Write a protein that binds this DNA or RNA. Structure first.
Lengths: 91, 59, 53, 81
RNA sequence: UGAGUAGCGAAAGACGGGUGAGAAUCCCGUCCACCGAUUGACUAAGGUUUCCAGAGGAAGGCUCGUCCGCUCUGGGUUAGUCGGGUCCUAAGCUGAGGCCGACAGGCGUAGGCGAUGGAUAACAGGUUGAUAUUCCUGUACCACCUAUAAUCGUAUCG
RNA sequence: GAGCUGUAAGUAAGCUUUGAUCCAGAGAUUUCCGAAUGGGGAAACCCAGCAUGAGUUAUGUCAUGUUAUCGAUAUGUGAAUACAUAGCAUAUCAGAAGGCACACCCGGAGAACUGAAACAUCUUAGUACCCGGAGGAAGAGAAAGAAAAUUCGAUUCCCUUAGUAGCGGCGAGCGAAACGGGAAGAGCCCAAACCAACGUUGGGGUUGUAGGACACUCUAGUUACAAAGGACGACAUUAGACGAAUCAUCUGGAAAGAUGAAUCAAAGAAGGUAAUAAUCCUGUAGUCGAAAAUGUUGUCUCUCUUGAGUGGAUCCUGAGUACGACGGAGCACGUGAAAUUCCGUCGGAAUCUGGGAGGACCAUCUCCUAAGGCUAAAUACUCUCUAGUG
């Protein structure tokens, strides 16, 4: 659904409306780490680190107008491509 | 291995009845006899029934 | 080749593994990823030789 | 051949008995006649004597594996591993 | 609840040092006391790591515990000759064919298996915290291989 | 199509768009025990023969193959004993053996507590257990039948007849069938008379509105029974792919809730997501896909293949069988006036102008043709699969 290094928007949670770059992925549990989201404080001094959120809480913005949208698959070329729902432009 | 060689006659099971009609299991053996009969390779000693030996036979 | 496939497995990947296991037991063998890499090399050499026959 | 599994490194083996005797770990199905031929071929030495002994599994719930260690005495040559 | 009640499993201990947060109970020393056809020293059956060292005190040890047959980590069993297999056999147990039995299966011959017995070549010292007729030192013996020399055979092995 | 190194957080060293892991169909490897089978043995162990190989100056050692016992088939196959029909040795073999599914099927063998308010006939019961055959089903099955109508027409199963007929220390209790309505539905091969060959099956022939031998008119079937061995196109099964439609405000640590305005529906089945989601995620409706491997079939191929036979004097069918007596068992039916069906022991028929049945037995009439074999579908059951339901 969301690949590593793509740009997404937080749709739900405590940081709703925060653009970031995915920098990690956990497909086994469906969780993804997005930079600047879910910062947590650990005890071991206090080392602040970023927690992983649910993959169903982030959306990909349109390339042209930066609008959160769903991903489609036209599959014209021999390799399938990700197509933005709002506009056919590839995401 | 107790049965006629020329037939399949063997023993069976039944009941023994008294005047009061009491039942007791018993056997009904066959009239087997040792005899030497012709076989394709050579004669041998086998168990032959008395019913089969009637009317004549080779020994 | 039939002979080359045998020569590479017998003297190499076998005596070479002997040194790795021997060196590790003594406590002076790092690079643990080199044992499994050689172990499976022998498995592939013996797979071709068995089907080629 | 592939009959030796691990050299033994202990105070009894390394600090003592290491002057001329070397201890190894052999397969659980090999006799002392096959350990003498294997040592010479791999280490290029001449073996003079060979002792062998068995060890039984130890409870640790499960048990550790069984071992078989042999001690070889060389006439000429030194391993110096 | 009974109740802080019964019990704490045959027996001689005392003092001076040491350790430590904590000592009638652990360690060392000196006196005293008990066994001694023995509570001493070796070895079958059975148990199966309870053996050694350093480090530990929650639980287990009928009190205590710094200690342990308890917990953690790492170690320890070396044979041509000692005891069993490539040697024999008692009882007994199993037996190709074979005999007898509704079915299973029950007997039994040649032949095999089976010690608690028969046959059969090593002893004295030394050494580790933990093994010793096994390792080491000094002197022996048995079976089997290889090459080279004694009888100048009408032997030799069965 | 970007991550991965099982459960598992770590600590490490590494692989991967040269496309890793992961999923599915095919191949390779597969230690020891165990029917265990070279011989032993206290299963997972010990000890050998033979052949061919490396090693070693030689002995010791090692590796890869073979050697159990019974059956059916070659070969030699000279003992008591001068045919020989004992044993005795080698060769060949997708020949046997053991193991499950507290389940279903057939056969052998076969209790008791209990009920009868005691108890022996009787019942519980041909039940439990034991053994021995199997098969995906088994079993049964082509009238020596049911009946009494102006007759029907292989077997099995369901409804009904009916708690009726009947059986019974006529006590307790046991308990039918045929007609009628349904599911399913095809029937065939041998023995004999006879015609040709030197106890191999070669023809011929298969039965009651009587058949065949013997004399006589004379141009389709398929290996699930009916004889059996292959070549030839299409649907399904075992990984997948695409798949419509939402934005704000208030209370919250968090919205899917509340308050407003928009949307998709052949998709409002469900499960997740920081709370109650048709439009956030995985899915659903619908529509596509198969290297290679299985199964079900359809076509031509392949094999195998002569049918009506008007006379009718002479010939033919299945025997120690049918049946009787004695002692038992089985049919709802306990020997009773007990027909019909079986086992053991003895005696023992007929031959188409024959023989059997219709509840003892006789006569008449009517309906069938025993003593040989095979046969799918409608029925029973569920280890364990893939979808689901309360």
């Amino acid at each position: 659904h969301i690949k590593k290094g793509d740009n997404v928007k937080v749709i739900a949670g405590k940081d709703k409306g925060k653009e970031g770059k995915v920098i990690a992925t956990l497909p086994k549990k469906d969780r993804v780490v997005v930079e600047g989201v879910n910062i947590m404080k650990k005890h071991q001094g206090i080392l602040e680190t970023e927690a992983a959120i649910h993959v169903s809480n982030v959306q990909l913005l349109d390339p042209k107008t930066n609008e959160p949208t769903r991903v489609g698959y036209k599959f014209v070329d021999g390799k399938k491509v990700r197509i933005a729902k709002k506009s056919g432009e590839e995401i | 291995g107790k049965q006629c060689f020329v037939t399949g006659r063997k023993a069976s099971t039944g009941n023994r009845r008294s005047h009061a009609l009491n039942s007791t299991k018993r056997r009904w053996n066959a009239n087997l006899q040792k005899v030497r009969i012709l076989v394709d390779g050579k004669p041998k000693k086998v168990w032959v029934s008395a019913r089969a030996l009637k009317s004549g036979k080779v020994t | 080749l039939t002979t080359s496939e045998i020569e590479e497995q017998i003297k190499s990947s076998k005596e070479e593994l002997f040194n790795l296991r021997f060196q590790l037991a003594t406590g002076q063998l790092e690079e643990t990823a080199r044992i499994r890499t050689v172990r499976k090399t022998i498995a592939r050499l013996k797979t071709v030789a068995r089907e080629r026959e | 051949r592939d009959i030796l599994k691990r050299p033994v490194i202990t105070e009894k083996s390394s600090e003592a008995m290491a002057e001329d005797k070397y201890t190894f770990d052999v397969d659980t199905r090999v006799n002392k006649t096959q350990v003498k031929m294997a040592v010479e071929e791999i280490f290029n030495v001449k073996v003079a004597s060979v002792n062998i002994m068995n060890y039984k599994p130890k409870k640790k719930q499960g048990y550790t594996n069984k071992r078989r260690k042999a001690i070889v005495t060389l006439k000429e040559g030194s391993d110096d591993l």
